[PDB]
Write a protein that holds these residues in place. Structure first.
Motif, PDB file in Angstrom:
ATOM      1  N   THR A  99      15.680  -0.359  -0.416  1.00 51.92           N
ATOM      2  CA  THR A  99      15.920  -1.835  -1.035  1.00 51.92           C
ATOM      3  C   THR A  99      15.725  -3.018  -0.131  1.00 51.92           C
ATOM      4  N   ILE A 100      15.441  -4.095  -0.570  1.00 49.43           N
ATOM      5  CA  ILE A 100      15.555  -5.236   0.231  1.00 49.43           C
ATOM      6  C   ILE A 100      16.556  -6.257  -0.377  1.00 49.43           C
ATOM      7  N   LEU A 101      17.434  -6.563   0.359  1.00 49.09           N
ATOM      8  CA  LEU A 101      18.376  -7.751  -0.318  1.00 49.09           C
ATOM      9  C   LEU A 101      18.962  -7.154  -1.456  1.00 49.09           C
ATOM     10  N   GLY A 102      19.182  -5.989  -1.679  1.00 54.18           N
ATOM     11  CA  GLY A 102      19.610  -5.451  -2.945  1.00 54.18           C
ATOM     12  C   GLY A 102      18.527  -5.061  -4.318  1.00 54.18           C
ATOM     13  N   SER A 103      17.242  -5.393  -3.867  1.00 52.60           N
ATOM     14  CA  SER A 103      16.306  -5.118  -4.909  1.00 52.60           C
ATOM     15  C   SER A 103      15.261  -4.193  -4.520  1.00 52.60           C
ATOM     16  N   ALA A 104      14.817  -3.277  -5.321  1.00 52.03           N
ATOM     17  CA  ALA A 104      13.815  -2.074  -5.164  1.00 52.03           C
ATOM     18  C   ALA A 104      12.324  -2.846  -5.733  1.00 52.03           C
ATOM     19  N   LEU A 105      12.205  -3.870  -5.673  1.00 47.18           N
ATOM     20  CA  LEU A 105      11.076  -4.493  -5.893  1.00 47.18           C
ATOM     21  C   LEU A 105      10.897  -5.893  -4.966  1.00 47.18           C
ATOM     22  N   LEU A 106       9.442  -6.240  -4.898  1.00 47.00           N
ATOM     23  CA  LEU A 106       9.235  -7.588  -4.291  1.00 47.00           C
ATOM     24  C   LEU A 106       9.542  -8.609  -5.029  1.00 47.00           C
ATOM     25  N   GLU A 107      10.538  -9.294  -4.641  1.00 43.80           N
ATOM     26  CA  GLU A 107      10.964 -10.771  -5.253  1.00 43.80           C
ATOM     27  C   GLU A 107      10.017 -11.820  -5.094  1.00 43.80           C
ATOM     28  N   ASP A 108       9.516 -12.583  -6.212  1.00 44.59           N
ATOM     29  CA  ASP A 108       8.761 -13.786  -5.841  1.00 44.59           C
ATOM     30  C   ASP A 108       9.306 -15.072  -6.639  1.00 44.59           C
ATOM     31  N   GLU A 109      10.809 -14.970  -6.972  1.00 49.19           N
ATOM     32  CA  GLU A 109      11.187 -15.960  -7.448  1.00 49.19           C
ATOM     33  C   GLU A 109      12.043 -16.979  -6.426  1.00 49.19           C
ATOM     34  N   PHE A 110      11.763 -17.003  -5.306  1.00 45.22           N
ATOM     35  CA  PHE A 110      12.358 -18.053  -4.194  1.00 45.22           C
ATOM     36  C   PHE A 110      11.145 -18.784  -3.583  1.00 45.22           C
ATOM     37  N   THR A 111      11.279 -19.911  -3.358  1.00 43.85           N
ATOM     38  CA  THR A 111      10.387 -20.617  -2.753  1.00 43.85           C
ATOM     39  C   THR A 111      10.767 -20.823  -1.348  1.00 43.85           C
ATOM     40  N   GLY A 150       9.220   5.056 -11.008  1.00 40.52           N
ATOM     41  CA  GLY A 150       8.252   3.680 -10.776  1.00 40.52           C
ATOM     42  C   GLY A 150       7.885   2.638 -11.719  1.00 40.52           C
ATOM     43  N   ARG A 151       9.050   2.638 -12.794  1.00 36.92           N
ATOM     44  CA  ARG A 151       9.181   2.072 -13.838  1.00 36.92           C
ATOM     45  C   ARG A 151      10.263   0.977 -13.576  1.00 36.92           C
ATOM     46  N   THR A 152      10.415   0.049 -14.833  1.00 29.76           N
ATOM     47  CA  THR A 152      11.243  -0.910 -14.640  1.00 29.76           C
ATOM     48  C   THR A 152      12.061  -1.160 -16.114  1.00 29.76           C
ATOM     49  N   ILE A 153      13.384  -1.624 -15.951  1.00 30.31           N
ATOM     50  CA  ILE A 153      14.113  -2.130 -17.154  1.00 30.31           C
ATOM     51  C   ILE A 153      14.519  -3.513 -17.013  1.00 30.31           C
ATOM     52  N   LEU A 154      14.226  -4.341 -17.867  1.00 30.94           N
ATOM     53  CA  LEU A 154      14.427  -5.704 -17.825  1.00 30.94           C
ATOM     54  C   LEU A 154      14.080  -6.364 -16.340  1.00 30.94           C
ATOM     55  N   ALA A 201      14.037  -2.495 -11.100  1.00 29.28           N
ATOM     56  CA  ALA A 201      13.639  -1.171 -10.557  1.00 29.28           C
ATOM     57  C   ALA A 201      14.687  -0.546 -10.252  1.00 29.28           C
ATOM     58  N   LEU A 202      16.034  -0.983 -10.336  1.00 34.68           N
ATOM     59  CA  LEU A 202      17.247  -0.134 -10.253  1.00 34.68           C
ATOM     60  C   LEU A 202      18.183  -0.365 -11.491  1.00 34.68           C
ATOM     61  N   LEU A 203      19.373   0.242 -11.504  1.00 33.89           N
ATOM     62  CA  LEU A 203      20.117   0.297 -12.576  1.00 33.89           C
ATOM     63  C   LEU A 203      21.170  -0.792 -12.391  1.00 33.89           C
ATOM     64  N   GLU A 204      21.288  -1.692 -13.267  1.00 33.60           N
ATOM     65  CA  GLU A 204      22.008  -3.026 -12.984  1.00 33.60           C
ATOM     66  C   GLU A 204      23.543  -2.866 -13.443  1.00 33.60           C
ATOM     67  N   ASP A 205      24.661  -3.249 -12.585  1.00 32.40           N
ATOM     68  CA  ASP A 205      25.873  -2.955 -12.976  1.00 32.40           C
ATOM     69  C   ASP A 205      26.433  -4.358 -13.041  1.00 32.40           C
ATOM     70  N   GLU A 206      26.076  -5.500 -13.015  1.00 38.38           N
ATOM     71  CA  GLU A 206      26.745  -6.624 -13.090  1.00 38.38           C
ATOM     72  C   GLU A 206      26.911  -7.456 -14.302  1.00 38.38           C
ATOM     73  N   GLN A 211       0.826  -1.417   0.041  1.00 40.64           N
ATOM     74  CA  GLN A 211       0.082  -0.045   0.049  1.00 40.64           C
ATOM     75  C   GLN A 211       0.712   1.284   0.028  1.00 40.64           C
ATOM     76  N   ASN A 212       2.127   1.323   0.367  1.00 41.72           N
ATOM     77  CA  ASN A 212       2.900   2.498   0.557  1.00 41.72           C
ATOM     78  C   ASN A 212       4.103   2.262  -0.365  1.00 41.72           C
ATOM     79  N   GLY A 213       4.299   1.218  -1.115  1.00 52.31           N
ATOM     80  CA  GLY A 213       5.651   0.888  -1.816  1.00 52.31           C
ATOM     81  C   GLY A 213       6.934   1.054  -0.621  1.00 52.31           C
ATOM     82  N   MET A 214       8.136   0.898  -1.422  1.00 53.02           N
ATOM     83  CA  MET A 214       9.239   0.837  -0.790  1.00 53.02           C
ATOM     84  C   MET A 214      10.095   2.184  -0.408  1.00 53.02           C
ATOM     85  N   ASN A 215       9.551   3.222  -0.875  1.00 48.71           N
ATOM     86  CA  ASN A 215      10.015   4.576  -0.413  1.00 48.71           C
ATOM     87  C   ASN A 215      11.200   5.185  -0.925  1.00 48.71           C
ATOM     88  N   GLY A 216      11.618   4.312  -2.092  1.00 48.56           N
ATOM     89  CA  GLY A 216      12.888   4.448  -2.500  1.00 48.56           C
ATOM     90  C   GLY A 216      14.096   3.763  -1.875  1.00 48.56           C
TER      91      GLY A 216
END
Lengths: 306, 306
Positions: free
Chosen positions: A280-292, B278-282, B285-290, A273-278
C-alpha cells in the motif's frame, strides 16, 4: 502529518443553497446577490426529459411559477432568464450571506469540493476531480441536482460546477455556472457516451511525492527514465501524456523532497509494469489520481482561509 | 447514486474556532457560549512537554496570560479552569454563533468529521473513524492541536473529539470535550504504544451492502456460514468479533437488499481467504472499514440537516 482527501470548509457555500420548485420538480439553487442559479430542467416533468424543447417550455412559465425557498424565508421572483443550460431567477432581496465569489470554468484533472444538497439543505461535503472525459464520480441521489462544486482562495469562493444529471452508466455530468456543460453532454434523458477515460498522470506523481513526505518510501527505485520513454509506457496503461508544463508544476515538490521528477517517473513505471505486490501507499492499494500538485502542497504546509 | 466518503457540512463549527495563545504556544480553541475549550498543553514550552507538571504550570498563569482571538475580535478572559486535559477559559462575551450542541464520548468503530484548523482558521474537512485502539489516522500539521471532530443530527452538533498529539508512530490521539483521553494516552512527549489495531468488521459489512446497492456485485457467493465459524476466520485476519448486536444493526440494510447478514459474512470470508483477485469494490482495492451502518443509510437515503 498524515494525508487525507480533504474538502474545503463549506460554511461560505451553505449560506447560499436554496430550494427551487417549478410545478412538480424541486431541486437546489445557488442564491448569490439577487440572482438564483439552478438547472433549467427544473421546468420539465418526467416525460419532457425524453425530448425537451426548453424555449417552448419556459414560455409557458411566468415569474410566479417559481417557488424559491431559503430555510423558511420565501423570495419573490421578478425576472427570469435562460443562459445556456442554467436558469437565472432575478429575486427581490440580495442574499445577506453572499461571499466574495467568482465563476470559473475548470480544466480536466483539477479538483473541487462538492456540497451535496437535497431540498435546499446541505447533506455532506467531499472532494472530487474533473475526469479527463469531463465526468465526475460523485454521490448524487434524486433531487441532488443543482448541488455545486467550488474551490476557496482565502476569502473568495470559485464556483466551478453545478450538477445536472446521472448518466445511464452511473457517472455524473454538469455545467459551469454559465450553464455550459463540461463535456459533450446535454440535459436530455438519452443514451450519452462519455469517452474513454484515462488517469491523471501529473496528479499520481503529486501523490507519490506526498507519500515520500509522509514516510512511505518503498517504491523509490535506483533507475531513471526519459520523458518520451515514460510517455510510451503511459499510453500502454491509459495514463495522460506527461508534458514539460507538468514537470514544471511538480517543481516545488521536487525541491522539498530532493527527488527529481524523472526519477519519480521511473518509480511510477515500475509500479505500472509490476503492480503494487500486495502493498500500500498512503493506505491505498491503487494509484490515486485525485490530488493535484497544488492540493498536496496546501495540505502539507497548512494553508487556511476564513 | 454513487458512494463517497462524505463529511458533514462544517458551517456550524467554523463559527466556533478561535485562536488561543499563551506565551509562545498558539493553537485552536472551541468557543461555545461564554467558554473557550482548548488543549491544556497550550501552557507548555517545548522543554516542558518532556515532563510537565500541569498544576504547577497553570499556577504561574493568570487570566490575562491567555490571548484569545476570533477573526480580529479579541475576547477578555475572566476565569480559567483545568478539567482533566482541557482548559476552560471563561470569556466575557457569549459566542453569537453558538449552535445547539452536545458533548459526546464516542465508541470505537464510530465515525466523525474533523475540521482541521491552523491559527483559529478552518483549512479543510474530512471523515475519519475512531480505531479499535483509540487512535485516529488523520492529517494534523504543527499547530493543528485543538481541532475538533463532530457529528451533526439535523440541528445539533455533537462534539466528540479534540486533537492533542501525534504519536511517534505517526498516528493521532486526543480527548473528548471533557478532557479525558481516548485510549491509554497522556499529554506528554514520550514513547506511547498504541495497542494492536484491528478491522471494524461491522463497518466492512455495511460497506459491502452499499456496494450491492450501487451495482457492485461480483463478490456475492452462493455459500453461507455461521456466526461462530465466521468469527474463527475473523480472528485469523485481525477483524473484530461479530456479535448479534452487530447483526441487528445491519438489519435495515439486510431488508433493503434482500441479502441476509450471514450470507454477506460468507462473501466476506472468501474475500479474506482469497483476496480481491486484482479487482475493486466501490473504487477501492482494499476492504474499507470507515463507514458505519448508519453512515451507509444516511448517504443512500439523502438525510439533510440545516
Amino acid at each position: 502529518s498524515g494525508f487525507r482527501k480533504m474538502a474545503f470548509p463549506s460554511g461560505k457555500v451553505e449560506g447560499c443553497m436554496v430550494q427551487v420548485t417549478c410545478g412538480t420538480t424541486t431541486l437546489n439553487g445557488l442564491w448569490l446577490d439577487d440572482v438564483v442559479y439552478c438547472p433549467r430542467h427544473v421546468i420539465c416533468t418526467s416525460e419532457d426529459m425524453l425530448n425537451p424543447n426548453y424555449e417552448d417550455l419556459l414560455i409557458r412559465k411566468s415569474n410566479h411559477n417559481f417557488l424559491v425557498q431559503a430555510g423558511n424565508v420565501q423570495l419573490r421572483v421578478i425576472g427570469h432568464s435562460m443562459q445556456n443550460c442554467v436558469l437565472k431567477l432575478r429575486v427581490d432581496t440580495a442574499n445577506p450571506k453572499t461571499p466574495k465569489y467568482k465563476f470559473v470554468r475548470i480544466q480536466p484533472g483539477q479538483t473541487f469540493s462538492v456540497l451535496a444538497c437535497y431540498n435546499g439543505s446541505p447533506s455532506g461535503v467531499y472532494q472530487c476531480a474533473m475526469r479527463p472525459n469531463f465526468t465526475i464520480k460523485g454521490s448524487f441521489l434524486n433531487g441532488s441536482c443543482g448541488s455545486v462544486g467550488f474551490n476557496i482562495d482565502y476569502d473568495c469562493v470559485s464556483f466551478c460546477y453545478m450538477h445536472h444529471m446521472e448518466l445511464p452508466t452511473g457517472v455524473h455530468a454538469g455545467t459551469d455556472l454559465e450553464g455550459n456543460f463540461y463535456g459533450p453532454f446535454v440535459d436530455r434523458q438519452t443514451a450519452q457516451a462519455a469517452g474513454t477515460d484515462t488517469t491523471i498522470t501529473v496528479n499520481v506523481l503529486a501523490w507519490l511525492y506526498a507519500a515520500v513526505i509522509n514516510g512511505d518510501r518503498w517504491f523509490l527505485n535506483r533507475f531513471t527514465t526519459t520523458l518520451n520513454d515514460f510517455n510510451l509506457v503511459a499510453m500502454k496503461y491509459n495514463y495522460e501524456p506527461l508534458t514539460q508544463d507538468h514537470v514544471d508544476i511538480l517543481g516545488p515538490l521536487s525541491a522539498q523532497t530532493g527527488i527529481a521528477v524523472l526519477d519519480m517517473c521511473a518509480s511510477l513505471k515500475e509500479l505500472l509494469q509490476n503492480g503494487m505486490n500486495g502493498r500500500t501507499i498512503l493506505g491505498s492499494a491503487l494509484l490515486e489520481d485525485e490530488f493535484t500538485p497544488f492540493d498536496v502542497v496546501r495540505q502539507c504546509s497548512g494553508v487556511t482561509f476564513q
